[PDB]
Amino acid sequence: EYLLENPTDAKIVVGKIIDAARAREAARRAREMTRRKGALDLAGLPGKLADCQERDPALSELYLVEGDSAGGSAKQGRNRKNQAILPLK
DNA sequence: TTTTTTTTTTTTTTTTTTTTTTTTTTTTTTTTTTTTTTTTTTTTTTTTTTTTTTTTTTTTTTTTTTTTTTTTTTTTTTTTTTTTTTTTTTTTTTTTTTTTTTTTTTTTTTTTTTTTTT
């Protein structure tokens, strides 16, 4: 409600947050985009992998879990944008 | 208000690589054919007393050609070296034991929908 009420202060705070995010992004290591597992294309990755939507590394995670039951428990609750799961045996 | 620069994913189809279906050659495997072993009995072979006329060894002496013999010069034998094979320490790898962590499959039964063939 406060953000909707105060446009100028909200814009100033958003500018500060964007500057902080840019400062965080500048220091990261150089990299390149990577294909991710998807419905239309699998990219030759395992069936057990439950990959994420984010194509950029440094904004994605891989959770190495112990089995298929733990894999399902972690896959049900996660963030599909960043987090991926690869259940071992 | 019109007009100008740049950015990427698509019209893409062709080159490279990968994956997936194939069928010549040395190593297994089932068959027939030839080496082994145990019984019957069977004429047949073979073990053992008696007699007998034989034909080769032992009295005695003879010689000659194999046994004496010495010596030259070869040539098999032995020495060193190195290579090839055999054989045994050494190491590596794999399997089994019993409590732990993880998973993965094949079929019945009915009813309805896709998904190919005719």
UniProtKB/Swiss-Prot annotation:
Outcome after substituting residue 66 to A/Q: Strongly reduced DNA supercoiling and relaxation activity. Reduces ATP hydrolysis in response to DNA binding, but has only minor effect on the basal rate of ATP hydrolysis
Lineage top rank: taxon: Bacteria
Binding-site residues for Mg(2+) 1, renumbered to this chain: 66
Subcellular location, record wording: Cytoplasm
Subunit structure: Heterotetramer, composed of two GyrA and two GyrB chains. In the heterotetramer, GyrA contains the active site tyrosine that forms a transient covalent intermediate with the DNA, while GyrB binds cofactors and catalyzes ATP hydrolysis.
Note from the entry: When the enzyme transiently cleaves DNA a phosphotyrosine bond is formed between GyrA and DNA in an ATP-independent manner. In the presence of quinolones this intermediate can be trapped and is used as an indicator of drug toxicity.
Family as reported in the entry's similarity comment: Belongs to the type II topoisomerase family.
Reported function: DNA gyrase negatively supercoils closed circular double-stranded DNA in an ATP-dependent manner to maintain chromosomes in an underwound state. This makes better substrates for topoisomerase 4 (ParC and ParE) which is the main enzyme that unlinks newly replicated chromosomes in E.coli. Gyrase catalyzes the interconversion of other topological isomers of double-stranded DNA rings, including catenanes. Relaxes negatively supercoiled DNA in an ATP-independent manner.
Protein name, as recorded: DNA gyrase subunit B
Organism listed in the record: Escherichia coli (strain K12)
